[PDB]
């Protein structure tokens, strides 16, 4: 099969700047007709792909002129000028010249925006969970930027590391921020032997940690 290699894998670009995404095929993707059936697609999280460019450099109806494509034979580049927030997503190249048609592995376009401090909220275990013998303390750290953040949990002032589960959302298509959920799950037995549960976040927007706590 024709292997389609994309670069970069991740592409952070500030709003307004230009982003260049490339694709290299393992062999020529010039179809026998002389045409080159190469396209660029963009897929946003939880959405179906959308066509951007076809036949290497032709913008599909409805596509902003900020998008353009170039290249030939085995090397192609999509250029997105004046990057906007809604450009967020994974870009894929594709060749429809040789069977089987093949796709590149995708390039995730990360948007660089103004730093934003997270809004942190902590929640104690529900009665339903306690009844089942477990006890999760949840901490949401919402709408922050940059994505880089460290969350530390403390129980009665002592750092706690076992039982922590973190999860992060994809960048927001509207405000370009990230959000994170950090859950500390103990057994009810252990939860009931302590008093203070703290979620503290280290982020560049604050010289010192943002601290939220829940006391039993």
């Amino acid at each position: 099969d024709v292997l389609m290699t994309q670069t970069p894998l991740s592409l952070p670009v500030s709003l307004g700047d230009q982003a260049s995404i490339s694709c290299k095929s393992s062999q020529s993707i010039v179809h026998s007709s002389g045409n080159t059936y190469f396209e660029w697609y963009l897929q946003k999280p939880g959405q179906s792909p959308k066509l951007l460019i076809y036949k290497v450099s032709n913008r599909f109806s409805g596509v902003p002129d900020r998008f353009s494509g170039s290249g030939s034979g085995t090397d192609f580049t999509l250029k997105i000028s004046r990057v906007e927030a809604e450009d967020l997503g994974v870009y894929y190249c594709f060749q429809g010249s040789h069977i089987p048609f093949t796709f590149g592995s995708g390039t995730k376009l990360e948007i660089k925006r103004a730093d934003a401090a997270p809004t942190v909220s902590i929640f104690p275990p529900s009665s339903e969970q306690l009844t089942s013998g477990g006890a999760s303390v949840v901490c949401f750290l919402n709408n922050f930027y940059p994505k880089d953040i460290n969350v530390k949990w403390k129980i009665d002032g002592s750092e706690r590391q076992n039982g922590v589960l973190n999860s992060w959302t994809d960048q927001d298509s509207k405000d370009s921020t990230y959000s994170m959920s950090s859950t500390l799950t103990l057994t009810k037995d252990e939860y009931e032997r302590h008093n203070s549960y703290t979620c503290e976040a280290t982020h560049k927007t604050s010289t010192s940690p943002i601290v939220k706590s829940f006391n039993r």
């Binding site: 396209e39 048609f101 592995s105 529900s126 089942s132 959920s181």
Partner: protein
């Protein structure tokens, strides 16, 4: 008005068969070839082949010659994808997409999950404390996916639903919603956690502790 609407999500065990549909509207079905593309989180997009909608002849990529069949029902402007003797690895989102010299229209995608593991419904826990953030913690379910909405979908702004994480305790996910403080608890906020696999939906109204 041109659309390719695909059938809903399926959950099957290995060895079973599944048939997915892709219905075109807004254009003459027989004027565009229809391709089928498999998408997985750990391999990306894989073109499975296509079917000529005028002649009815299918073309299968080599990795899909065998257990897969493409067929049509032109009177209903529908393309079908049938997968026989399902395998765990067939777990993926399948898209139909029409193609002239590009895929200008893609279907809505159909997620097929194939697992021999025991389905286990979700335990849903309420997360209560100018703006107030609330949430739901969803634990102990299998397999993915779980769908979370707030107020049956009418509360969509300020929502953050986090990707699931599988651990010893099976899948865990959480979702937060932020609303004006003056509107809760006066205007109720309920999370609805749907788990098609277990044919279960749990609705938890968040109330003050």
């Amino acid at each position: 008005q041109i659309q390719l609407v695909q059938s809903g999500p399926e959950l099957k065990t290995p060895g079973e068969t599944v048939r997915i549909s892709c219905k075109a509207s807004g254009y003459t079905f027989t004027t565009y070839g229809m391709s089928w593309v498999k998408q997985t989180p750990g391999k990306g997009f894989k073109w499975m082949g296509w079917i000529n909608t005028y002649s009815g002849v299918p073309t299968y990529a080599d990795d899909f010659k065998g257990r897969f069949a493409f067929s049509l029902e032109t009177s209903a402007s529908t393309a079908y994808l049938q997968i026989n003797n399902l395998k765990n690895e067939d777990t993926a989102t399948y898209f139909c997409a029409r193609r002239s010299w590009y895929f200008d229209v893609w279907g809505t995608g159909t997620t097929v999950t194939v697992s021999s593991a025991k389905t286990t419904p979700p335990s849903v826990y309420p997360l209560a404390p100018s703006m107030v953030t609330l949430g739901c913690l969803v634990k102990g379910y299998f397999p993915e996916p779980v769908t979370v909405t707030w107020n049956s979908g009418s509360l969509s702004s300020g929502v953050h639903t986090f990707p699931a994480v599988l651990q010893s305790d099976l899948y865990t996910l959480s979702s937060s919603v932020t609303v004006p403080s003056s509107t809760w608890p006066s205007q109720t906020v309920t999370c609805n956690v749907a788990h098609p696999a277990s044919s279960t939906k749990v609705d938890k109204k968040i109330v003050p502790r």
